[PDB]
Amino acid sequence: DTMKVINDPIHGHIELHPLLVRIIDTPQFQRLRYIKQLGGGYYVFPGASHNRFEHSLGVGYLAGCLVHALGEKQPELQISERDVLCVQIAGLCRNLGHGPFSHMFDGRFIPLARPEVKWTHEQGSVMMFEHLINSNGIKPVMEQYGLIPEEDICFIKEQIVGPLELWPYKGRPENKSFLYEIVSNKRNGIDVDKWDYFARDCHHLGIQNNFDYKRFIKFARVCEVDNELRICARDKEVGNLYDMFHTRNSLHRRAYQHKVGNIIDTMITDAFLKADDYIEITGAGGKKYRISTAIDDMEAYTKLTDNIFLEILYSTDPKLKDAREILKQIEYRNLFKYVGETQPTGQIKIKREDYESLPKEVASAKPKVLLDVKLKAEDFIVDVINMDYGMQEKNPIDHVSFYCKTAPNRAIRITKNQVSQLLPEKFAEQLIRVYCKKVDRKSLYAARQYFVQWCADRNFTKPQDGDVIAPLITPQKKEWN
Amino acid sequence: DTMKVINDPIHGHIELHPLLVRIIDTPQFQRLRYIKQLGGGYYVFPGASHNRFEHSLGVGYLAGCLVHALGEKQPELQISERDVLCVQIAGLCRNLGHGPFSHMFDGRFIPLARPEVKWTHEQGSVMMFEHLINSNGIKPVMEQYGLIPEEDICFIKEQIVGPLELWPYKGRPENKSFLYEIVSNKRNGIDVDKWDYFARDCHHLGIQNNFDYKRFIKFARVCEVDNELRICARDKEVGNLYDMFHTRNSLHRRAYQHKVGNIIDTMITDAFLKADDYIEITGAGGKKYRISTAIDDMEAYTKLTDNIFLEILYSTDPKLKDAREILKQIEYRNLFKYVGETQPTGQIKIKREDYESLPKEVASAKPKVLLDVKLKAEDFIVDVINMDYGMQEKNPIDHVSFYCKTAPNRAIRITKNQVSQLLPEKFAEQLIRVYCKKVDRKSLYAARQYFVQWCADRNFTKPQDGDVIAPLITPQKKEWN
Amino acid sequence: DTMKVINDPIHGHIELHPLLVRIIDTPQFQRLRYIKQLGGGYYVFPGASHNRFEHSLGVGYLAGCLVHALGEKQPELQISERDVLCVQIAGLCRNLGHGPFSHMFDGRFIPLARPEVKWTHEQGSVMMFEHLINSNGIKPVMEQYGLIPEEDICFIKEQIVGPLELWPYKGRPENKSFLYEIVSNKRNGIDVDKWDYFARDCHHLGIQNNFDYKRFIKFARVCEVDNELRICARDKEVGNLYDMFHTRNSLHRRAYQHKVGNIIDTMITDAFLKADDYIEITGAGGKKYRISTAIDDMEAYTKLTDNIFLEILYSTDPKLKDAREILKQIEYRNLFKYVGETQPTGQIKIKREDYESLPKEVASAKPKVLLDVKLKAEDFIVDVINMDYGMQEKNPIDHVSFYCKTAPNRAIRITKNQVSQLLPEKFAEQLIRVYCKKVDRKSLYAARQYFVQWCADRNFTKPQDGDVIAPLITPQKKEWN
Amino acid sequence: TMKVINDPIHGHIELHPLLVRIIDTPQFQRLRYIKQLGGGYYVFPGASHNRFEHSLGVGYLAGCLVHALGEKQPELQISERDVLCVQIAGLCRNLGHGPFSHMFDGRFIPLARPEVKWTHEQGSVMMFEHLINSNGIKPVMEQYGLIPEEDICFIKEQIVGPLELWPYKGRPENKSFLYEIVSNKRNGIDVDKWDYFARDCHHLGIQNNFDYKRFIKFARVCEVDNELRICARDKEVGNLYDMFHTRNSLHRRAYQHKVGNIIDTMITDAFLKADDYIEITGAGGKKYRISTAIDDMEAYTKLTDNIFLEILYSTDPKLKDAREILKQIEYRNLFKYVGETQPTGQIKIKREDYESLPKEVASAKPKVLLDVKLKAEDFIVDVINMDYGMQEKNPIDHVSFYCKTAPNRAIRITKNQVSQLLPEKFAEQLIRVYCKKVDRKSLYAARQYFVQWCADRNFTKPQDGDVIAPLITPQKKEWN
Ligand SMILES: O=c1ccn([C@H]2C[C@H](O)[C@@H](COP(=O)(O)OP(=O)(O)OP(=O)(O)O)O2)c(=O)[nH]1
Ligand SMILES: O=c1ccn([C@H]2C[C@H](O)[C@@H](COP(=O)(O)OP(=O)(O)OP(=O)(O)O)O2)c(=O)[nH]1
Ligand SMILES: O=c1ccn([C@H]2C[C@H](O)[C@@H](COP(=O)(O)OP(=O)(O)OP(=O)(O)O)O2)c(=O)[nH]1
Ligand SMILES: O=c1ccn([C@H]2C[C@H](O)[C@@H](COP(=O)(O)OP(=O)(O)OP(=O)(O)O)O2)c(=O)[nH]1
Ligand SMILES: [Mg+2]
Ligand SMILES: [Mg+2]
Ligand SMILES: [Mg+2]
Ligand SMILES: [Mg+2]
Ligand SMILES: [Mg+2]
Ligand SMILES: [Mg+2]
Ligand SMILES: [Mg+2]
């Protein structure tokens, strides 16, 4: 059993250690071939056909590169081949828990189908990894390559989902803390997962990013902070780190939160909810599950992928008619109509409990205009998107350590006004999109009136095309000229 | 309504006339989102997740570009917007007939399952297009934008499949003959389908494209040739044209005919053959069809995509067990073993009717090696591959017309001797790959002995690793020494 | 005289009209092959070997593309072939006036060698262009192609530098106002010049470009604004527009204002100063000129290129001993040492009239630490960089007109709060870099103490490595630590 | 300390301080002023890259290959000293290039110094010696664990071959594979090629189809004929053929572009007419000509593309002629391409026949009525040898391969074992004819002369033959 080489368009020829090969050649890993990275985004960007599989290969590769580079530059860290392999496996397996259409499933479907439970794709990754190991005889292969199953499996899980419950990690001591910053960085969000999806998503979407992860790896060091060994960036790179997050935000603005892509994720979520009772997925022993309950049994979850979209589309049963028809609306491109975008003002934000009261509000506005129809709450969709730098209101660069050329072992901090005045003032904000399920001319005119009026009543930002879609409405708001 | 813009990672922003949008937004066309361009190639090249949908868009785009450029450079040709639109539609629609995993379906599955039928994906494209037209109310929409459905539908079909039966075409007169050279070039095979797949497949496989189609388009012109108007190329580009085909060959050698990709297509085909008596696909009138019979009913064929792979894989029915098992062999990477490659020598050419008897020849070989395993004919797979420049044994550049700078309307011919002595001396050859369905070490050893002996017996070429995998066989053959 | 095609790595195959061909093949234009786009940047980024020549080709090409797109989308604008050609000529010729090492010349050398005159590369471009036209008999070729030299030459120069002085233009009337927005946009800075250098500089530097100019071109219209027919962008694009400026900023930060690249431009500049009495360039009639004076005779300026750097370098004349030695220090990489970067705080704005006072202040600072060596004013360099969005303190997007899909001919305005709260609050800032000419250790320590103390006294931002380069000085400033 | 350089081709490359010290010398920095493709820049405007960045690239790739070999196979005993020597060799193998690169050693020198045997290789060795001596590199080398006597010899041998049975001195036979990296005299597969494939493609606007990273990943060292040599994996053989095919393509499209070559020729002519009058100052203040600068490394250090601009800008009337040719380049008044043909049969044209060629063309007697009579000073005949790097031989016959099943056993693979669609021949010649007189009538004449000549010598029919000379072509029965 030898290394295999895989050719990836992003990273080139990637070498895979035989243990990694063993992990990859399982139903649990191969499942990721049938889950689109960007979910419904493929229906807007036809280049975005990539799946979580190739992305995961990429993450394992980059984890390997960063750990090896650190060990190579700093022998005093005593990074072992075992550490390298463990970081590699963590990188390969942190996407194991994604469901159909990726972030649609944990972001939209699950919270609606099962409001009581709090599921994340990370927990799904830990559970799925445990099921892969246990179902495929991986433990003895691990020990066969000088890994210690007990400690190392724990380590892998921890890298993926953080502490399983003062130094909180049991997989590795403080003197190897930096290993936990590579795959999924809880501290500042700077990790190789972001790097792979930046490059890969850009390559498939046909839009480009200027973040250079290779450069970052070149200047990465391990230095001591707060009695921990942590990864530090070279000082002169601070400007680039800021740009990194800018790139993230840009990618969210252009692709990941494209209004139509989001409405397609919403319509698919909708079809999944109408189908949940009727689609049977066989789990362990023979117990049958639903889409919403498959997350309870990894055997059933292994068979839960993008495929059910087509399963719903191709079905003939009356019980699935309503599900089916929605999907067909997607095929005919009869999508819900986008009405518009606005934002709250001040330090006023919309929290999660108010999300379902919003269609009603939009429907409750009184545009002093004569309409041919009346719309009700059920006719509107209100989608609230949080855009941030990955730590709510915080600046993540406040949580990065730097080192300078004159004392490369000394960690320091760099504040925002040590860098530039042209940087953002805040680091979190909310976008509000409104869509109408009635797609005829009249109803959409009406919808625009209700919408702009609702914006005026709540002192939100003036829609960019406000003066065009509601000329009778905008003048009442003097703050809009 | 109005035109749309699509961002494609290969061509950038592609503009779509609303009629094209109407054609694309149908089940018949959207179907192509669920058919991988390279079929089983994705299982070897993880970047190759692209489907026939995006490829089809790219082809329609390029057909548009070429006809437009011709029109702009030579107004005397009288190309109308109607012509442009019909060529764009043909470009968009020549891929409509592809089945699950593309060339696996018409190259491997149909020939085995329905050997009495002479099916091609092109015919499939014509029937599927007829069904899209009729099921989606397209004719009046065509009339609305200035097209004449009778004639123009004829024209499109002819561009896809050739004459539906001296001028054999009824969709356009001889003075527009060059328009038939764009989408699917029956004369020499230089068309825009190739250009799109060169660039897109290369972009996704992580292999770099050598061919510059924009350059070609800039130096394309129409000239009179044998009382016919044809697309001719600038003389200086003749080398480039040769390189084009070289590229095609290279792509076939590295990717499209990859030994493992091919064995994967073969295993999927085997599974389909074993699932064929059980999978039912509802056609028109609620009539039932099989995977093998879907091609007789466009309503059923519409529902026949890559999804069946998963339908088979997730099935619980005992009667599907076998098929299911084969697919599971794929997930665990327990694939049929590659034994070797050889070629015929002299002027021996393997006939299509001789294919079936080949594993029997191999099993009946008598290698002088001691073996603890005897293999039967049914243990061997023999895959015969015809590699050519697209016109069997002919040089396609002998079917290209050129023009000179000084006389831009005088068509000429250029022979291979006028170009280089470093070019191929033949334009077709056969590659014979042998595989073994028994994957154990002993079986693979024995299979290697049989294979090399069979090569010796038939005076085929010495396998590249012959001296290594069969050191006791290769000495007997003096022509190899 | 027919069309030529040029292959360019950025744009691919550029078609050049015979008139542009005749303009390009002159000494005046070919001169640009010998002037590096990024001056001293090549000494830091080895891929940046590109010259002003190819950039000029790119700019001309894109100007052509934009005017052409505008014309095909809106025939009512009556754009003529004349217009296309003049916009192309302006695009081709707007870089004609650059001098040795590009921005080094008009940005450092001329302002120091000739404080009394106000000169810029744009004026250089108009003068050079006039010279080209008259020395090469271009007017009759222009007339041969249907141009009208009187108004068209004016139109071209106007596009390059603006009004030569109510509507202030002679070349074209108000209903063609948008044509003045293409090559050099004096209203908001969005023009094709920027687009070409984004793409080209990124290609050569090894940094990736994230601005998509083809998308912009595709979404651009012409609308009525304040009695003028201006170019408007789709509302949707607003985010991207902001990103466009961000990119510009990033490119300045990473490459164009690189500390070492700037110090190299400085050393080259003062070498030119040392050589300014002693080098002779033969001008019109046979007169002699200096490097600082070739600016006054176009025939002399034609021979002023990067070549001069080598003249000095290769010289043996004792009169040039000083200059020469400096260039040699660049060859051995014995450069002035960088000691730090800081910014002003509050409302403080370092004026040009004060630059000269800066090295004296640093030498005047009294650090309060043990120094082995004293440094004087001559030992310091202070470089002041003005970073902005190209309109000083103003937001350029406030000066951009938009349109919505609902009523495409209806120009509108978009404000910053209508886009994002994560945007810059300020659109201009200043960076202050300090270097020391004395390069030994002790000198460097000294320079660091002086510098940090100076930042402390001037109430400037605390240097990033401040606690490391001068620990004994930093705790005296309460706002800092 | 170490330095990081951002290259558009390879990304962020790390240079050891020793390499930095070698690089920060006038002898090395000189390469910033010499264009990789010379006159090619006047046809492909993206092709502005110089030898400096290419040299960095070659150094980097040499380091990559030797390091990969070392990591996969510890038993080879590759030391950091070996690594450094191979890097230095890659970094320095382009040091001997003159103005406009291959124009200088390919066109100028053979016409100006026909008695000398000169290669950019020899110049690289001499320039390396001079660089080492003029900058005190030896003690820096010793400082980083190098042994100057052995190692300098090793580097020179890597660049130019043996200096004159194991013919090498810098390293023994068990390190033979080290000699296959920077300049492979055995089959021509080396990192120099790989770098220029990628860089030239990047700047030309043509896409490279050879994947050298894949090659590096698959390369191993195996024992072959009592040497340890680099071996490629068997199944890569196709790709190897493609590599040479790629080389040929690049020559067809760019390096041997008709107009690119005529521009190189015009520049050469200008240098020839300038050579008696340009003065370069070398050691001891002594003076040298362009054609003699190669005899003194101090003066060669100052010999770059700048010469072009020194000639164009000159005011000295002695340099008038020279200056006027370059000016015609600026006005795009170039010698006119009349056509391309090829020898048939076993006929092969040798260098010593070259100068006789314009004479034969002017002596041909086209049976058409003309207006001007052309002479043998109005014609230019350029002869191009296109091959796979080893004249008539197949370089793949000089590659060692290994198989997955026995990775330490080297094997050979023949052409017939790979494909019948491969070339039957591995070398050929292209004959281009240009005319120095650019009027329509002289051009028509030149065409008639050219085709008549092609017929007389039984050469191949020019591609535009029927068009540029409809009265000449139907005579030659073999073209019909
Ligand atoms: O010319 C090629 C051939 C293959 N690949 C890719 C496909 C795959 O992702 C990786 C490895 O395939 P390869 O053919 O090298 O390995 P293999 O099929 O498993 O052969 P073997 O087991 O004999 O090493 O390289 C390329 O990029 N270029
Ligand atoms: O910043 C962006 C936004 C979108 N796209 C792509 C996505 C899509 O393939 C195409 C068009 O999307 P767009 O957002 O422009 O169209 P739309 O969503 O239909 O908006 P509208 O109907 O209002 O024009 O361009 C980009 O490349 N970059
Ligand atoms: O295979 C090629 C050949 C040329 N070029 C470039 C070189 C140049 O930048 C442009 C045009 O050169 P071309 O050879 O096509 O024109 P020409 O030399 O002037 O020949 P002719 O006058 O017969 O058209 O195309 C390529 O990119 N690829
Ligand atoms: O954001 C950047 C900055 C620089 N470079 C390039 C330029 C150069 O080729 C190489 C190294 O430059 P750098 O600025 O990192 O090194 P330096 O100027 O020598 O700084 P220092 O000596 O303090 O490490 O990286 C980039 O690619 N991106
Ligand atoms: Mg394998
Ligand atoms: Mg994350
Ligand atoms: Mg839309
Ligand atoms: Mg075809
Ligand atoms: Mg030409
Ligand atoms: Mg430095
Ligand atoms: Mg060589």
**Any atom of ligand 3 within 6 Å of the Cβ of B26:** no
- Neighbouring residues of A130: CB distance < 8 A, sequence distance ≥ 6: A153, A157, A298
Taking the C-alpha atoms of residue D55 and residue D88, their distance in angstroms, rounded to an integer, is 10
Give the tokens for residue D421.
């669609």
Shortest distance between the Cα of A314 and any Cα of chain B, in A, equals: 7
Q: How far is CA C78 from CA C71, C84, C150, C176, C222, in A?
A: 7, 11, 20, 9, 12
Interface contact B324, partner A, CB < 8 A: no
Single out the residue in C334, C352, C385 at which a domain terminates.
C334
Task: State whether D22 and D77 are in the same domain.
Answer: yes
What are the backbone dihedrals phi and psi of residue A14, each rounded to the nearest 5 degrees, phi first?
A: -100, 125
Asked if A421 and C426 touch (Cβ cutoff 8 Å), the reply is: yes
The CA dihedral of A326, A328, A333, A337, to the nearest 10 degrees, is: -10
Asked if B303 and B282 touch (Cβ cutoff 8 Å), the reply is: yes
Chain C residue numbers with beta carbons less than 8 Å from the beta carbon of D331 are: 25-27
Taking the C-alpha atoms of residue B296 and residue B292, their distance in angstroms, rounded to an integer, is 9
The helix or strand, by DSSP H or E, that contains position C73, with its residue range, turns out to be helix C52-73
DSSP D383: E
Burial call A5-41: b when 16+ CB within 10 Å, e when fewer = ebbbbbbebbebbebbbbbbbbbbbbbbbbbbbbbbb
Asked if B17 and B64 touch (Cβ cutoff 8 Å), the reply is: no
First to last CA, chain C: 71
Taking the C-alpha atoms of residue A21 and residue A23, their distance in angstroms, rounded to an integer, is 5
The residues pairing with B5 across neighbouring beta strands, listed in sequence order, are: B15
Residue A447 identity: A
Asked if D159 and D93 touch (Cβ cutoff 8 Å), the reply is: yes
Taking the C-alpha atoms of residue A260 and residue A72, their distance in angstroms, rounded to an integer, is 46
Residue for token pair 């072009």: D308
What is the DSSP secondary-structure string of B91-149?
Answer: HHHTTTT--TTTHHIIIIIHHHH-TT----HHHHHHHHHHHHHHHHTHHHHHHHTT--H
| Alpha-helix residue ranges (DSSP H) falling in A162-280 | 192-205, 213-218, 238-251, 259-275
Task: State whether C329 and C340 are in the same domain.
Answer: no
Taking the C-alpha atoms of residue A369 and residue A470, their distance in angstroms, rounded to an integer, is 10
CATH number, domain of B252, equals 1.10.3210.10
Task: State whether B293 and B352 are in the same domain.
Answer: no
Whose CA is closest to atom 2 on ligand 4? C254
Residue C320 identity: L
Asked if C199 and C10 touch (Cβ cutoff 8 Å), the reply is: yes
Q: Which sequence positions of C are flagged as catalytic?
A: 121
> Which residue in chain D has the smallest CA separation from A11?
D213
Q: Which of B6, B13, B195 to mutate to test the interface with C (most CBs of C within 10 A)?
A: B13
Q: Mark which residues 343-372 of C lie under 8 Å from A by CB.
A: 343, 345
The helix or strand, by DSSP H or E, that contains position B60, with its residue range, turns out to be helix B52-73
Looking at the 3D structure of chain B, how many domains does it have? Answer: 2
List of chains touching D (3+ CB pairs within 8 A): A, B, C
Nearest of C202, C206, C60, C209 to residue C129 by alpha carbon:
C60
Q: How far, in Å, is the centroid of ligand 1 from the Cα of D221?
A: 20
Task: State whether C256 and C404 are in the same domain.
Answer: no
**Any atom of ligand 2 within 6 Å of the Cβ of A260:** yes
> Which residue in chain A has the smallest CA separation from C465?
A404
DSSP C210: -
Taking the C-alpha atoms of residue A130 and residue C105, their distance in angstroms, rounded to an integer, is 65
Region of A217 on the Ramachandran plot (φ > 0 left; ψ -120 to 50 alpha; else beta)? alpha
Give the tokens for residue C458.
């001037």
Interface contact B7, partner A, CB < 8 A: yes
Q: Which ligand is nearest to the CA of A16?
A: 1
Taking the C-alpha atoms of residue A363 and residue C279, their distance in angstroms, rounded to an integer, is 79
Taking the C-alpha atoms of residue B213 and residue B219, their distance in angstroms, rounded to an integer, is 10
Nearest of A35, A26, A164, A165 to residue A99 by alpha carbon:
A35
Q: How far, in Å, is the centroid of ligand 6 from the Cα of A62?
A: 14
CB atoms inside a 10 Å sphere around CB B446: 22
Helix (H, G, I), strand (E, B) or coil at C480: coil
Task: State whether D95 and D235 are in the same domain.
Answer: yes
CB pairs under 8 A between A and B: 89
- Neighbouring residues of C343: CB distance < 8 A, sequence distance ≥ 6: A417, A421, C429, C430, C431, C432, C460, C461
| Alpha-helix residue ranges (DSSP H) falling in A114-206 | 121-136, 138-144, 149-161, 192-205
Taking the C-alpha atoms of residue B77 and residue C421, their distance in angstroms, rounded to an integer, is 56
The CA dihedral of D109, D110, D116, D117, to the nearest 10 degrees, is: 100
Burial class of A479 by CB neighbour count within 10 A (0 to 12, 13 to 18, 19+):
exposed
What are the backbone dihedrals phi and psi of residue D350, each rounded to the nearest 5 degrees, phi first?
A: -95, 155
- From the list D206, D238, D428, the residue facing B420 with the nearest CB is D428
Chain A residue numbers with beta carbons less than 8 Å from the beta carbon of D12 are: 212, 214-215, 218
First to last CA, chain B: 72
- From the list A207, A414, A422, the residue facing C212 with the nearest CB is A207
Task: State whether C360 and C373 are in the same domain.
Answer: yes
Task: State whether D316 and D425 are in the same domain.
Answer: no
Q: How far, in Å, is the centroid of ligand 6 from the Cα of A184?
A: 6
Taking the C-alpha atoms of residue C463 and residue C382, their distance in angstroms, rounded to an integer, is 15
Taking the C-alpha atoms of residue D302 and residue D310, their distance in angstroms, rounded to an integer, is 12
Residue for token pair 């491997």: B108
Pairing of strands C228-234, C401-403: parallel
Q: How far, in Å, is the centroid of ligand 8 from the Cα of B183?
A: 9
For the CA atoms of chain B, what is the radius of gyration?
25
A208:C207 CB<8 A: no
Residue for token pair 């499933």: A105
DSSP A100: T
3-state SS string for D392-444: CCCHHHHCEEEECCEEEEEECCCHHHCCCCCECCCEEEEEEEEECCCCHHHHH
DSSP A276: T
B421:D342 CB<8 A: yes
Q: Which of D29, D54, D316, D440 to mutate to test the interface with C (most CBs of C within 10 A)?
A: D29
Pairing of strands A281-282, A288-289: antiparallel
| Alpha-helix residue ranges (DSSP H) falling in C339-465 | 358-364, 441-457
Interface contact C7, partner B, CB < 8 A: yes
Nearest of B306, B305, B284 to residue B296 by alpha carbon:
B284
Asked if B46 and A196 touch (Cβ cutoff 8 Å), the reply is: no
Nearest of B102, B103, B126 to residue B183 by alpha carbon:
B126
A424:C424 CB<8 A: yes
Q: How far, in Å, is the centroid of ligand 10 from the Cα of C44?
A: 9
Taking the C-alpha atoms of residue A45 and residue A207, their distance in angstroms, rounded to an integer, is 10
State which ligand 3 atom lies nearest to the alpha carbon of B239: 1
The residues pairing with B340 across neighbouring beta strands, listed in sequence order, are: B434
**Long-range contacts from B142-145, C-beta under 8 angstroms, 24+ separation:** B142/B19, B145/B17, B145/B18, B145/B19, B145/B85
Single out the residue in D287, D314, D333 at which a domain terminates.
D333
Helix (H, G, I), strand (E, B) or coil at A446: helix
**Biggest alpha carbon distance in chain A?**
77
Chain D residue numbers with beta carbons less than 8 Å from the beta carbon of B241 are: none
CB pairs under 8 A between A and C: 113
Single out the residue in B334, B355, B383 at which a domain terminates.
B334
Task: State whether A366 and A325 are in the same domain.
Answer: no
Beta strands in A310-406 (DSSP E): 337-342, 380-388, 401-404
Nearest of A194, A220, A223 to residue A209 by alpha carbon:
A194
Beta strands in B172-311 (DSSP E): 220-224, 229-234, 281-282, 288-289
State which ligand 3 atom lies nearest to the alpha carbon of D252: 1
Taking the C-alpha atoms of residue D398 and residue D189, their distance in angstroms, rounded to an integer, is 10
Residue B450 identity: Y
**Biggest alpha carbon distance in chain C?**
77
Helix (H, G, I), strand (E, B) or coil at A5: strand
**Range(s) of the domain holding residue B63:** 1-334
List of chains touching B (3+ CB pairs within 8 A): A, C, D
**Any atom of ligand 1 within 6 Å of the Cβ of A3:** no
The residues pairing with A13 across neighbouring beta strands, listed in sequence order, are: A7
What are the backbone dihedrals phi and psi of residue D407, each rounded to the nearest 5 degrees, phi first?
A: -60, -10
Q: Which of A310, A320, A439, A441 to mutate to test the interface with B (most CBs of B within 10 A)?
A: A310
Asked if C239 and C367 touch (Cβ cutoff 8 Å), the reply is: no
Taking the C-alpha atoms of residue C444 and residue C448, their distance in angstroms, rounded to an integer, is 6
Residue B33 identity: R
**Any atom of ligand 3 within 6 Å of the Cβ of C6:** yes
**Any atom of ligand 3 within 6 Å of the Cβ of D44:** yes
The residues pairing with D162 across neighbouring beta strands, listed in sequence order, are: none
Name the experimental technique.
X-ray
First to last CA, chain D: 71
Give the tokens for residue C208.
């990736």
Q: Mark which residues 160-199 of A lie under 8 Å from C by CB.
A: none
Give the tokens for residue C37.
């786009």
**Any atom of ligand 4 within 6 Å of the Cβ of D4:** yes
Asked if D443 and B446 touch (Cβ cutoff 8 Å), the reply is: no
Give the tokens for residue B378.
């049914």
Task: State whether C294 and C344 are in the same domain.
Answer: no
The residues pairing with D12 across neighbouring beta strands, listed in sequence order, are: D6
Asked if A155 and A171 touch (Cβ cutoff 8 Å), the reply is: yes
Helix (H, G, I), strand (E, B) or coil at A340: strand
List of chains touching A (3+ CB pairs within 8 A): B, C, D
**Long-range contacts from B410-419, C-beta under 8 angstroms, 24+ separation:** B410/B223, B410/D467, B411/B223, B411/B224, B411/B225, B411/B230, B411/B232, B412/B235, B412/D463, B412/D464, B412/D466, B412/D467, B414/B235, B414/B238, B414/D463, B417/D460, B418/B238, B418/D460, B418/D461, B418/D462, B418/D463, B419/B238, B419/B239, B419/B242
Nearest of C271, C259, C257, C311 to residue C113 by alpha carbon:
C271
Burial call A246-260: b when 16+ CB within 10 Å, e when fewer = bbbbbbbbbbbbbbb
Discontinuities in chain A (C→N > 2.5 Å), after residue: 165
Task: State whether A312 and A375 are in the same domain.
Answer: no
Give the tokens for residue A182.
């590579």
Pairing of strands D400-403, D406-411: antiparallel
What is the DSSP secondary-structure string of B294-360?
Answer: GGG-HHHHTT-STHHHHHHHT---GGGHHHHHHHHHHHTT-PPEEEEEE---TT----GGGGGGHHH
Overall size of chain A counted in residues: 481
**Any atom of ligand 1 within 6 Å of the Cβ of B260:** yes
Q: Mark which residues 235-264 of B lie under 8 Å from D by CB.
A: 235, 238-240, 243, 246-247, 249-250, 253-254
Whose CA is closest to atom 23 on ligand 3? B405
Task: State whether D444 and D315 are in the same domain.
Answer: no
Taking the C-alpha atoms of residue A386 and residue A388, their distance in angstroms, rounded to an integer, is 6
Task: State whether D340 and D454 are in the same domain.
Answer: yes
Give the tokens for residue B270.
């085997």
Using alpha carbons only, what angle is made at residue D258 by residues D252 and D264, rounded to the nearest 5 degrees?
Answer: 110
Catalytic-labelled residue, pool A17, A50, A98, A121: A121
